[PDB]
């Protein structure tokens, strides 16, 4: 695994020893090459895992997340090139350093054979994101947003640490392989109930769970474009990955303890999809859509059936790509209009036709149009839920209908109708933005050809 970690570390001295006007080119080229190298982790086994060493191991759940993490950095650099133009070389190098450190921590987090090492890196990712949000955000609310994004996380994560060390004091190890092979049932006890809660709540808060989702709209709205991209694409999936790893020690207590979270997610997906219908801000609408999709992923993980896990993996990958694309489109509009109010700039199809095509395809993938991987994950989760209980179909279908409604509402409001007359600074789309949009969308339509790459270890 060092053949990916070491180049990502070398990205830092290369960035800091670069010319003042070569940082973006060098960073983009070498991050793309690192993505290409990481692409060879996809050759997974039907047996246990790719156990590289005592410290790092790869799995067909970890490999798609690793590849998406490596692929996201070049897109983040391309998106950040525009709004950082008027800023000094040292500060741009610091921004690229924060992005590189975030990638390094995420890469080490997804392999992380140890649960304490996983926790340490899973919490180390917090610092670069907070600095990016509270340093290079625009509005005055960013500081407040950062505070939320901080404390919520720690409010969930501090009990987990205690639980973790407690387990190693009883089991003797926190290695995931030993934990899986030596797993034992949890008796229905108050102590075991609180151990279950301490294990679950940390990952629940970062999905986020419906009741615990307040930090996400603030953090995603006030963050710069690279921050929003990394928050929606990779950082939300840490909770799902952690739950998928940790639910192996929580059986059979998950059967009883899953009910409040299942109800919260099943009702909150409807609530947040309905919230999307009445939203005056593009970024907030995209954030609430992310909350709905992650609610579906929470349901899938809580059901803990093979089809549930496959659907959850597919949906995590598809949502990451789609939400990053949607945020990039919103930012392309914002850098022209500087308002971030959906109703202000209207009828952009007549002025930006190719960008309108990008908007249409992004809305189509968000709408879960078959045979996209978005719908593959959606349908697998829905079928698993139907087997779990036939009444889930009402909530699932209502969520599908509202999702289509708000996706097409977002498309029609911004692209169709009549152009706003007083806005005359809508310049033609740059090659950088179109390239960014294509680099988001072609991986999705190309992954629909080989779904088993993103269906997880239970395929």
């Amino acid at each position: 695994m060092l053949k990916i970690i070491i180049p990502t570390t070398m990205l830092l001295p290369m960035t800091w020893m670069s010319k003042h006007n070569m940082i973006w080119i060098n960073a983009t080229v070498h991050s793309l090459l690192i993505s290409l190298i990481s692409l060879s982790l996809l050759n997974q086994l039907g047996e246990n895992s790719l156990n590289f060493s005592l410290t790092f191991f790869s799995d067909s759940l970890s490999a798609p997340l690793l590849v998406l993490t490596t692929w996201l950095l070049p897109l983040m650099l391309m998106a950040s090139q525009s709004h950082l133009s008027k800023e000094t070389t040292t500060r741009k190098k610091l921004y690229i350093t924060m992005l590189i450190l975030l990638q390094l921590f995420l890469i080490m987090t997804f392999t992380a054979t140890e649960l304490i090492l996983f926790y340490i890196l899973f919490e180390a990712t917090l610092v670069p994101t907070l600095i990016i949000i509270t340093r290079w955000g625009n509005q005055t609310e960013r500081l407040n947003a950062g505070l939320y994004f901080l404390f919520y996380t720690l409010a969930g994560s501090l009990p987990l640490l205690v639980a973790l060390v407690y387990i190693q004091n009883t089991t003797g190890s926190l290695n995931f392989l030993i934990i899986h092979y030596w797993s034992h049932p949890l008796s229905n006890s108050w102590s075991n109930i609180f151990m279950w809660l301490a294990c679950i709540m940390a990952f629940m808060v970062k999905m986020p769970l419906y009741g615990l989702h307040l930090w996400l709209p603030k953090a995603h709205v006030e963050a710069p474009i690279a921050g929003s991209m990394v928050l929606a694409a990779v950082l939300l999936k840490l909770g799902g990955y952690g739950m998928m790893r940790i639910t192996t020690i929580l059986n059979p207590l998950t059967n009883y303890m899953a009910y409040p979270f299942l109800m919260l997610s099943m009702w909150g997906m409807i609530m947040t999809s309905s919230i999307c219908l009445r939203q005056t801000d593009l970024k907030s609408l995209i954030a609430y859509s992310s909350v709905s999709h992650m609610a579906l992923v929470i349901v899938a993980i809580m059901i803990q059936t093979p089809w549930s896990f496959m659907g959850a993996t597919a949906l995590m990958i598809a949502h990451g790509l789609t939400s990053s694309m949607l945020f990039c489109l919103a930012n392309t509009n914002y850098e022209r209009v500087h308002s971030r109010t959906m109703i202000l700039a209207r009828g952009l199809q007549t002025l930006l036709p190719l960008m309108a095509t990008w908007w249409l395809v992004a809305s189509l993938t968000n709408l879960a149009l078959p045979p996209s991987i978005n719908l593959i994950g959606e349908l697998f989760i829905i079928t698993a839920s139907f087997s779990w209980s036939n009444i889930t179909i009402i909530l699932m279908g209502m969520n599908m209908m509202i999702t289509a409604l708000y996706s097409l509402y977002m498309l029609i409001t911004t692209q169709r109708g009549k152009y706003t007359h007083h806005i005359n600074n809508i310049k033609p789309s740059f090659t950088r933005e179109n390239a960014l949009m294509a680099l988001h969308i072609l991986p999705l339509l190309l992954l629909t050809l080989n779904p088993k790459m993103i269906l997880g270890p239970l395929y």
Partner: protein
Amino acid sequence: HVTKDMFPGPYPKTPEERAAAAKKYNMRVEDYEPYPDDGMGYGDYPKLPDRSQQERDPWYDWDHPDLRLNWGEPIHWDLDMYIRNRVDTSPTPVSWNTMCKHLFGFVAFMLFMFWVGEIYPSYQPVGPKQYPYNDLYLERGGDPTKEPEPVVHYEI
């Protein structure tokens, strides 16, 4: 370019701050009417008529012809509810209650009559259709190891 004094604030209590709020929203003091002071966070915001954007004059030269809005005029709290793409409140040729009664009445009658027609079906003066080999026993389900009871068809 908006200052702090030009943003929505708390519910006005005295007529002086009521006049200040009316002046802020570019509308007459006599026309200004905030939402009732309840637990909802309406605060200081005009309660415009609940009429939809569709019934606004379509021959006026609006600054936003599609939305039928002017530049500085106060925006209804539920603008995104009434955008000619969504629910409209335009007067109808028939009263709402009359339409509701008629629609409900028609649906109920059809539903009732379908149940009645289920009670009293329509058919022809014929006996059951007959099929030769033990009512097609082996072609419908099979189990050829059971030898079912023979059913004999009458010649008439």
